[PDB]
Design a protein around this ligand. Structure first.
Ligand SMILES: *[C@@H]1O[C@H](CO)[C@@H](O)[C@H](O)[C@H]1NC(C)=O
Ligand SMILES: *[C@@H]1O[C@H](CO)[C@@H](O)[C@H](O)[C@H]1NC(C)=O
Ligand SMILES: *[C@@H]1O[C@H](CO)[C@@H](O)[C@H](O)[C@H]1NC(C)=O
Ligand SMILES: *[C@@H]1O[C@H](CO)[C@@H](O)[C@H](O)[C@H]1NC(C)=O
Ligand SMILES: *[C@@H]1O[C@H](CO)[C@@H](O)[C@H](O)[C@H]1NC(C)=O
Ligand SMILES: *[C@@H]1O[C@H](CO)[C@@H](O)[C@H](O)[C@H]1NC(C)=O
Ligand SMILES: *[C@@H]1O[C@H](CO)[C@@H](O)[C@H](O)[C@H]1NC(C)=O
Lengths: 49, 49, 164, 273
């Protein structure tokens, strides 16, 4: 019959997924465990946390 | 005040319906996305219902 | 007999809070598109637009009265981005009787349909229905004083309601 | 080494009314011109906080007050007498304990095992040859075997002079996180969060540290108290009704369980009835 009829529903799909995270600064001194000037022996091994 | 009650009762009942989406209803999480991301799909169907 | 530099490492999980996760990096920033935004502690689908809000330096989240996330900061740049939901609405088909004609007009309700003749109304927009300047009597209601009909080799026209 | 302080005169501490003070921001959410009801460990309105007076009577007090669920701290200090606080369970080098010292260079934070003395204090020595104050006594602890968390801020300088500003603090211990809510003002005051300290320890008692002025005797009597006054409050699990403005700052607060007038305000989500 003549009139207006609601048939379906319209929605837009998301185009892409975007992931955010803060900056990677304030890092621990990890460069000294591999580039130290001298490594200790096995009987006096360094205990680092 | 007669016209103020029609706007107030319709808006407050709408805000109640939005507030029902944050209810746990006995489940682990009120938000839907954390249920799938933390529970296995073979037993997630109890928490969905 | 050549000496080697051997470094061992160990991982554990105590009741203390975590320190290192990946830090797993990020992606680029996309604005004015319907995307799945992810952040430090929230996930959702929405469109990001530039805002002029007055967020406190310690404040990151933003909620309305109905406790829905409206504006969150991107964590690297000091910038404010609004979140409005991706546009949705019902689909209404405006047609005359099938004994008269089979032509239809599709009304996409509550959407700016440049994202999906095209005539923009206050109830959405009309696809396949043209707009005429003269005003006729309403037979098929749409909303906001706009009514469609089947008149003049024949096509669906849209006009303003004649009150009398 | 640890030393005890003699010539102490006992006096009962006074109690001062808190005129709607001690509120903070409960979360990170920006809110514009709304009225939000929260449920958090808050200081009750018109509560009897404990007033400690440090005036020269030779009154110098810093007892080991308990840390039940959160402590409100205030200081009407004009000479930087109040520096830091002890945090720990038993303070006998048997439980893992926290330390905050804001001495003359950095805000240094150690969280490890400390053999705390009977009278933990920060003593500063005065040199009369050049009219300058330099910190020389550090008798907080004895030794530490291993330490988990260590924090050192950027260096600065202090005047360290007793002059002839309200520093406000709220400390909480939730899910292994240490949170400090603080602001500096010269009533109503909303405290912004400053330092998030995710350590993961259990704290039962606390004790503040004062910078007594030293100049007329041995190390246990040659000192003066100066001018200092700090308030200690205790948070309680009660609900509020905050008033966020158009720019996010809290401008007013309503305690729900104070009087029956505000019970109507909390159940109607409005400030005018
Ligand atoms: C050590 O130093 C060199 C040169 O300074 C650098 O190229 C390298 O990435 C550093 N790290 C390791 C693990 O070798
Ligand atoms: C993030 O850190 C890098 C250093 O690797 C720096 O160049 C960049 O400017 C920082 N981003 C912001 C927004 O500060
Ligand atoms: C729809 O988008 C266009 C941009 O081309 C804009 O000019 C128009 O104002 C928008 N309509 C509404 C109702 O916002
Ligand atoms: C309706 O009138 C406007 C001027 O007011 C004109 O620009 C438009 O083309 C007209 N539309 C039709 C279908 O005649
Ligand atoms: C200080 O007094 C306490 C009171 O019991 C005592 O145990 C301690 O040995 C004294 N001396 C110090 C801490 O040097
Ligand atoms: C302040 O304390 C830190 C750590 O406890 C120490 O390194 C520094 O020397 C102290 N400042 C002075 C002036 O002694
Ligand atoms: C906007 O924010 C500022 C803080 O910078 C505040 O002083 C001002 O009162 C706010 N505006 C209004 C209308 O409250």
């Amino acid at each position: 019959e003549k009139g207006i009829y609601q048939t379906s529903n319209f929605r837009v799909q998301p185009t892409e997924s975007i992931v955010r995270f803060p900056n990677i600064t304030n890092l621990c001194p990890f460069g000294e465990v591999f580039n130290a000037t001298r490594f200790a022996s096995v009987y006096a091994w360094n205990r680092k946390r | 005040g007669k016209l103020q009650d029609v706007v107030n009762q319709n808006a407050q009942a709408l805000n109640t319906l939005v507030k029902q989406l944050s209810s746990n209803f006995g489940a682990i999480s009120s938000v839907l996305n954390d249920i799938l991301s933390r529970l296995d799909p073979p037993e997630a169907e109890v928490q969905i219902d | 007999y050549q000496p080697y530099r051997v470094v061992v490492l160990s991982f554990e999980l105590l009741h203390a809070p975590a320190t290192v996760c990946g830090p797993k990096k990020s992606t680029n920033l996309v604005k004015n598109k319907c995307v799945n935004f992810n952040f430090n502690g929230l996930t959702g689908t929405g469109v990001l637009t530039e805002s002029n809000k007055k967020f406190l330096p310690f404040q990151q989240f933003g909620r309305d009265i109905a406790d829905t996330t409206d504006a969150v900061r991107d964590p690297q740049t000091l910038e404010i981005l609004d979140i409005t939901p991706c546009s949705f609405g019902g689909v209404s088909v405006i047609t005359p009787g099938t004994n008269t004609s089979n032509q239809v007009a599709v009304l996409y309700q509550d959407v700016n349909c440049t994202e999906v003749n095209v005539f923009q109304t206050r109830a959405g927009c009309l696809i396949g229905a043209e707009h005429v300047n003269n005003s006729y009597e309403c037979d098929i209601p749409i909303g906001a004083g706009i009514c469609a009909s089947y008149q003049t080799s024949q096509s669906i026209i849209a006009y303003t309601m004649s009150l009398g | 080494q640890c030393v005890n302080l003699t010539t102490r005169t006992q006096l009962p501490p006074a109690y001062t009314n808190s005129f709607t003070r001690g509120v903070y921001y409960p979360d990170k959410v920006f809110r514009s011109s709304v009225l939000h009801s929260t449920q958090d460990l808050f200081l009750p309105f018109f509560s009897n906080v404990t007033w400690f007076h440090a005036i020269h009577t030779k009154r110098f007090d810093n007892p080991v007050l308990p840390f039940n669920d959160g402590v409100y701290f205030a200081s009407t200090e004009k000479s930087n007498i109040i520096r830091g606080w002890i945090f720990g369970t038993t303070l006998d080098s048997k439980t893992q304990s926290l330390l905050i010292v804001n001495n003359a260079t950095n805000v240094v934070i150690k969280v490890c095992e400390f053999q705390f003395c009977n009278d933990p204090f920060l003593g500063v020595y005065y040199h009369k040859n050049n009219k300058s104050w330099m910190e020389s006594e550090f008798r907080v602890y004895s030794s530490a075997n291993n330490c988990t968390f260590e924090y050192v801020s950027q260096p600065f300088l202090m005047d360290l002079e007793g002059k002839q500003n309200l520093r406000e603090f709220v400390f909480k211990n939730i899910d292994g996180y240490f949170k400090i809510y603080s602001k500096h003002t010269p009533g109503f005051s909303a405290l912004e969060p400053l330092v998030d300290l995710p350590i993961g320890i259990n704290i039962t008692r606390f004790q503040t540290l004062l910078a007594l002025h030293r100049s007329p005797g041995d190390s246990s009597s040659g000192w003066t108290a100066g001018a200092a006054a700090y308030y200690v409050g205790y948070l309680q699990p009660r609900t509020f009704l905050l008033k966020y403005n158009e720019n996010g700052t809290i401008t007013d607060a309503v305690d729900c369980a104070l009087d029956p007038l505000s019970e109507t305000k909390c159940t109607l989500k409005s400030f005018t009835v």
